[PDB]
Design a protein around this nucleic acid. Structure first.
Ligand SMILES: [Mg+2]
Ligand SMILES: [Zn+2]
Ligand SMILES: [Zn+2]
Ligand SMILES: [Zn+2]
Ligand SMILES: [Zn+2]
Lengths: 63, 96, 97, 122, 500, 56, 181, 166
DNA sequence: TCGGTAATCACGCT
DNA sequence: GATTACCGA
């Protein structure tokens, strides 16, 4: 957990944050793509059913 | 008159299945949802102003480039507790 | 201002005390309390300047129980005030669980 | 940016855009809301009714012709000359006073000789 | 309809706090008193509304949907921030004073520029690289550009700094460093030396670590709890901010008129002490600033953290809606993947149904019937969004033409997928989507072979169900989580739901 | 070309949400059915329009 | 001056008209998004011409409608800076005059009109010069130059354009021809 | 030379009195607040306040000595002067940033002006809202304004850069 | 070797 | 109050 991840992934583990959360305040970006972040911010997680990609054409006659 | 609370055990027993649609709908849709206006090039929140319409981010004063972002209310308060302390949380948002 | 509801006040007497042996259930009231103004000039919400009334606070049974009252106490405690004690019982046949 | 990208743009005179207004107004003719066009569209139709000075095709033919005479004349300069219809060196001065190139009286008169044609003469 | 791409952190400049803030606060006062609760300081000086009074910064903004706004404090003297202070010492002992350089030769600059991009991916490998630059600048006292002007050695623990300077011949007096003396040194660092430290020239300037302007948090983050009926318990953050302004106020008057020169430096340290508890109360070497009844104050670092803070307490584990919790009691007459549900819990939980074309004959009857008889509805919804509750005085005018597109909320019936839960949630399998059957009493019932997954027994335990609602999250529950898919277990292959 | 268990529970999920927002139904009628149960009957006869993308 | 655009954009087809042909069902969506809306980048978008090509549908988690990537043609009108324009005086005021140059309007104040002291006749609807007896009144075709454009919001109505006519060879068209002799 | 300009800054910050303090302080090079009061002849309270203001501008330092007997910490002030030509430039750098901006604004701004001895030089933003009349005096607004000064100020900037560049 | 300091210690419920 | 381990002479 203390090794490389998102900086929010290290926030909910090792409640230490003025050691750790203010350290990566200096020159640090944070993209995405954990499992603990997208649940924390409101996005679908990548594992499970958020991995499939759909596509569908559209004449769609009922018959 | 309050319900149950779903700890960190109960969040992880749904990720083990593979349910990602249920995990959104349970934790945020049946909870607090707030709609927030956010600037684009500063990253900070905008400020609405009734009686005079027009919304504008103070920091660098823009006019039209501004949108709406859909996020929980407890995450929006996490922005302010990092804002009272001198940390600045710049948001750099993305199209769908 | 701050009305809890209506037709929850069908058991009270004139002064605000339940005459005993009444089937209090749900969120029915027990003692009707009027509170004093609490900031008369902050709001002025288009009719509240003339109304000048009070902000309703009260006591009501916990919103899952039932039962009937047994005895109502009324006295004065040490300083000068007044405090009423009301107790409500229940029958509770042994069903499942 | 409108949408994702802008890839192509062209310059349209008022005589060219008159047909685009009437063909759009030809739809509606849909009759379920009766489709009345919005206010500023109906206002801009009246501006086409008063400045329709030329045929639609002869304005397109002249605008192609003026670009090939000089290299420093683009479509935007040619589309401006259709609305004004210059007659002499007076209008060539006032249009080209805020351009990147101010014409000489030799080269500007050669432009006038081309626009001696396509005149309504009425 | 956008989404969050990336969150980028940094430090607020004192310039940026002024543009963000709407008011300056100079009055240590809350209400004063019992009528017109408006002051010139810490409360609503166009700062944030928490009461049902509509007065805000010209923007209407009733107490529902009013975001608070930030204020600022013009601190008269500079003050060291607590959390950065461990890393300010790393900067000071690794810079050549009076000029602003890095105490390295151009050879090691040109070599260690190239090592940044080679190890340009992993975090742990570049964090070890920044110590050796700190190592080499420590063991030098002769700089290549100033002729060794008697570099002092810094000192720390916790906040007070010193220097080992010589005065007469070889003296070792410890001149205590002032925050005004520190911040003058930090502004002389050029922006190009910042990649050689762990800093960034646009997001983290080092001189912004010394707080010249302290921002004030909004009203909506510091609520006012009412005690009995009219007495208001002041919030712990509010109570310390009131006491900050009274130690500032005199200090402004103290240096503008008073001239004893001794209490000033004594007052100076009170400022430090008093904001240090406000950032993190439980630091070491600092007596905890108590509340005047016997409770220590939970300031910002304890509101963010503390085993019930705001990562596990409120953000990643939240309280939910549409649930219930009661006891369990067997019955071996229902199938393996059904569940009993009491009819009291069944009439206080609802799913949305969205009448399309072929259930229109059904949901006319579910909404005509009231919320009394068990096939019934509670809340109807128009496509605009104005819900119409059904309880009051008529349902006939809503049981008219129901106008395809609406969404009716009716009670649970025999067939709607629910979930179930045990709470100690040890392994993967103690939540499993069942198939509701409704029976009159007050207990959840449960088939006997499904009780080695839950690891339960029937001596008065408690199991909680919670209905899923939206039509994507409900057809996911039925296909992926029903009981019969979980007859064998992922720990050993052998069957788990079996005979007892 | 058999579907997995994660793709089968997403195709039903997207089709049950279209079938509530308009999108006229195939031969699925009888007598009263919640919008989730209409998607289950359509998937059995193999007349789903929605296809997956398999990144490879 | 009008322009013709060719722009791709992402189209959102709802599932109500899910059973129509993709061309005209995407045309009726994309037309009711950009007509009559002033952007700060290009200008007044008047009308959608036609739909050339369309892509496939893609479902996104949460909505259930489909997304497409179409190609369309847009007629815009851009009053850019230092542009020589033509208009019509359709309003008479004592402090200025609204000149309709198309879908938008242009106000010219009384002291950028001409090289003359200008007196407003209060009884009639006209301007009368001091020395010269030229009369500018209602309905007269003029020629001017843009000097200032005030762009504030997305609405056409609340944005106003400043013009001027203090140059040799502007104003009414018959004033220019009769001053040749 | 250069002594005067230092007094000028002190006059801006303190005044005539502060100028007296500096010259007296130069003579002994080290002094306490009390010792200065005897040298000047003006209350130690006023003298000490002057030193506080100069401290914020970075122009005096102090060292602390431990009195062996009573244990009283008394401060010795001194002047520091290895900071003169940097602070003189770095203040005028920011001022020339401010003087770049004024002429830039004016071009992109004020076109209208009221013809009174007060409230002139309004903007089209105001004017449009204000219906092209003044709300303070009611005079009719006028046109293209301050044409002489917007050229002349541009010539003022170039010398100062050259001067500070030296 | 050798002394020193923080930072950590189930689930739910009253 | 107990385990560690990282940090500091
Ligand atoms: Mg048990
Ligand atoms: Zn911004
Ligand atoms: Zn507000
Ligand atoms: Zn150096
Ligand atoms: Zn005036």
């Amino acid at each position: 957990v203390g090794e490389k991840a998102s900086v929010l992934a290290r926030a909910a583990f090792e409640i230490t944050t003025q050691h750790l959360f203010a350290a990566a305040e200096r020159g640090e970006v944070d993209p995405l793509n954990g499992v603990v972040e997208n649940v924390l911010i409101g996005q679908p997680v990548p594992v499970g059913t958020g991995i499939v990609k759909l596509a569908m054409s559209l004449p769609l006659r009922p018959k | 008159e309050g319900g149950l609370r779903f700890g960190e055990m109960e969040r992880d027993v749904l990720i083990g299945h593979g349910a990602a649609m249920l995990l959104i709908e349970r934790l945020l849709e049946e909870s607090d949802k707030t709609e927030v206006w956010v600037c684009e090039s500063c990253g900070h929140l905008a400020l609405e102003d009734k009686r005079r319409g027009k919304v504008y981010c103070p920091v660098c004063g823009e006019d039209e480039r501004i949108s709406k972002v859909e996020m929980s209310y407890a995450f929006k308060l996490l922005l302010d507790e990092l804002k009272a302390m001198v940390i600045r949380p710049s948001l750099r948002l993305k199209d769908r | 201002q701050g009305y809890l509801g209506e037709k929850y006040y069908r058991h009270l007497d004139e002064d605000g005390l339940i005459f005993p042996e009444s089937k209090v259930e749900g969120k029915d009231v027990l003692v009707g309390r009027t509170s004093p103004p609490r900031f008369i000039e902050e709001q002025s919400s288009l009719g509240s300047m003339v109304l000048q009334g009070r902000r309703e606070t009260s006591v009501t049974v916990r919103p899952s129980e039932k039962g009937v009252v047994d005895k109502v106490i009324v006295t004065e405690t040490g300083d000068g005030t007044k405090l009423v004690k009301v107790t409500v019982r229940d029958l509770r046949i042994p069903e499942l669980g | 940016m409108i949408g994702r990208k802008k890839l192509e743009e062209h310059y349209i005179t008022i005589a060219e855009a008159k047909e685009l207004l009437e063909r759009r107004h030809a739809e509606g003719l849909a009759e379920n809301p009766e489709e009345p066009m919005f206010y500023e569209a109906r206002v801009s139709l009246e501006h086409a009714e008063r400045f329709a000075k030329l045929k639609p095709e002869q304005a397109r033919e002249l605008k192609e012709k003026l670009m090939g005479l000089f290299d420093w004349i683009n479509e935007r300069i040619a589309a401006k000359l259709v609305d004004i219809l210059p007659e002499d060196y007076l209008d060539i001065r006032v249009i080209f006073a805020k351009e990147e190139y101010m014409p000489t009286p030799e080269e500007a008169e050669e432009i006038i000789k081309v626009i001696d044609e396509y005149r309504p003469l009425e | 309809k956008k989404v969050i791409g990336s969150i980028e952190f940094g430090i607020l400049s004192p310039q940026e706090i002024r543009k963000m803030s709407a008011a300056e606060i100079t009055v240590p006062d809350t209400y004063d008193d019992d009528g017109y609760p408006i002051e010139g300081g810490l409360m609503d000086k166009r700062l944030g509304v928490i009461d049902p009074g509509l007065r805000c910064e010209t923007c209407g903004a009733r107490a529902g949907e009013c975001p608070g706004h930030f204020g600022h404090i013009e601190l008269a003297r500079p003050v060291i921030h607590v959390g950065f202070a461990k890393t300010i010492h790393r900067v000071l002992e690794s810079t050549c004073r009076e000029c602003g350089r890095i105490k390295l030769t151009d050879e090691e600059i040109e070599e260690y520029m190239q090592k940044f991009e080679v190890m340009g991916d992993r975090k742990g490998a570049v964090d070890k690289l920044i110590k050796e630059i700190h190592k080499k600048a420590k063991e030098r006292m002769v700089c290549p550009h100033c002729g060794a002007p008697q570099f002092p050695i810094k000192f720390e623990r916790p906040t007070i700094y010193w220097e080992l300077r010589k005065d007469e011949e070889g003296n070792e007096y410890k001149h205590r460093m002032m925050p005004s003396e520190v911040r003058d040194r930090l502004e002389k660092i050029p922006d190009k030396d910042l990649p050689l430290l762990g800093l960034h020239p646009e997001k983290s300037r080092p001189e912004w670590m010394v707080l010249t302007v302290l921002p004030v948090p909004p009203v909506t983050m510091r609520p006012s709890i009412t005690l009995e009926s009219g007495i208001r318990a002041e919030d712990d953050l509010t109570h310390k901010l009131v006491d900050i302004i009274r130690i500032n106020n005199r200090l402004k008057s103290n240096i503008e008129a008073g001239a004893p020169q001794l209490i000033i430096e004594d007052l100076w340290d009170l400022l430090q002490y008093h904001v240090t508890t406000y950032i993190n109360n439980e630091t070491s070497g600092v007596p905890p600033a108590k509340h005047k009844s016997g409770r220590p104050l939970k300031t910002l670092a304890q509101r963010l953290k503390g085993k019930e803070g705001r990562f596990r307490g409120n953000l990643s584990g939240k309280r939910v809606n549409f649930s219930a919790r009661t006891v369990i009691s067997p019955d071996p007459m229902i199938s393996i993947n059904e569940v009993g549900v009491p009819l009291a819990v069944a009439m206080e939980l609802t799913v949305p149904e969205k009448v399309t074309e072929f259930n229109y004959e059904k949901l006319k009857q579910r909404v005509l019937n009231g919320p009394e008889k068990y096939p019934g509805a509670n809340y109807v919804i128009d496509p605009e969004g104005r819900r119409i509750r059904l309880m009051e005085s008529n349902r006939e005018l809503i049981a008219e033409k129901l106008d395809i597109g609406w969404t009716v909320e009716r009670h649970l019936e025999d067939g709607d997928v629910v979930l179930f839960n045990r709470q100690p949630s040890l392994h993967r399998m103690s939540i499993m989507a069942h198939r509701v059957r409704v029976m009159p009493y007050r207990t959840f019932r449960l088939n006997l072979p499904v009780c080695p997954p839950y690891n339960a027994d029937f001596d008065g335990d408690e199991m909680n169900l919670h209905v899923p609602q939206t039509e994507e999250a409900q057809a996911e529950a039925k296909i992926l989580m029903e009981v019969q898919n979980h007859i064998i277990s992922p720990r050993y292959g052998g069957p788990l739901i079996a005979g007892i | 070309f058999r579907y997995t268990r994660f793709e089968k529970a997403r195709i039903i999920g997207a089709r049950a949400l279209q079938i509530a927002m308009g999108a006229p139904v195939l031969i699925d009628v009888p007598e009263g059915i919640t919008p989730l149960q209409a998607a289950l009957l359509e998937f059995e006869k193999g007349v789903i329009p929605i296809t997956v993308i398999r990144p490879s | 001056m009008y322009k013709l655009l060719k722009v791709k954009d992402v189209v959102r087809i709802p599932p109500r008209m899910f059973t129509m042909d993709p061309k005209e069902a995407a045309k009726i969506v994309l037309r009711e998004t950009y007509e009559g809306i002033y952007d700060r980048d290009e200008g007044v978008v008047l009308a959608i011409l036609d739909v050339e090509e369309i892509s496939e549908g893609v479902i996104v988690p949460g909505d259930g409608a489909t997304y497409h990537e179409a190609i369309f043609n847009v007629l815009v009108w851009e009053p850019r800076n230092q542009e020589v324009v033509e208009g019509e005086v359709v309003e008479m005021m004592p402090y200025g005059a609204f000149i309709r140059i198309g879908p938008m309007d242009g106000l010219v104040h009384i002291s950028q009109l001409m090289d003359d002291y200008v007196v407003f006749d209060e009884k009639n609807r006209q301007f009368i010069g001091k020395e010269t007896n030229r009369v500018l009144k209602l309905g007269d075709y003029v020629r001017a130059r843009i000097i200032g454009v005030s762009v504030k919001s997305r609405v056409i109505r609340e944005n106003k354009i400043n013009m001027t006519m203090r140059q040799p060879g502007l104003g009414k068209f018959e004033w220019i021809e009769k001053e040749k002799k | 030379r250069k002594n005067k300009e230092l007094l000028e800054i002190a006059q801006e910050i303190g005044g005539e009195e502060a100028v007296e303090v500096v010259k007296a302080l130069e003579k002994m090079k080290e002094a306490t607040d009390e010792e200065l009061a005897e040298a000047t002849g003006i209350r130690v309270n006023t003298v000490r306040r002057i030193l506080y203001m100069l401290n914020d501008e970075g122009l005096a330092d102090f060292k602390r000595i431990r009195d062996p007997e009573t244990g009283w910490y008394y401060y010795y002030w001194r002047l520091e002067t290895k900071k003169l030509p940097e602070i003189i430039r770095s203040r005028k750098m920011a001022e020339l940033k401010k003087l770049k901006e004024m002429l830039e604004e004016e071009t992109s701004e004020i076109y209208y002006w009221c013809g009174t001895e007060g409230h002139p030089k309004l903007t089209f933003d105001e004017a449009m809202e204000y219906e092209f009349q003044c709300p303070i005096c009611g005079k009719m607004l006028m046109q293209y304004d301050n044409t002489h000064i917007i050229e002349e100020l541009k010539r003022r900037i170039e010398e100062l850069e050259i001067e500070l560049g030296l």
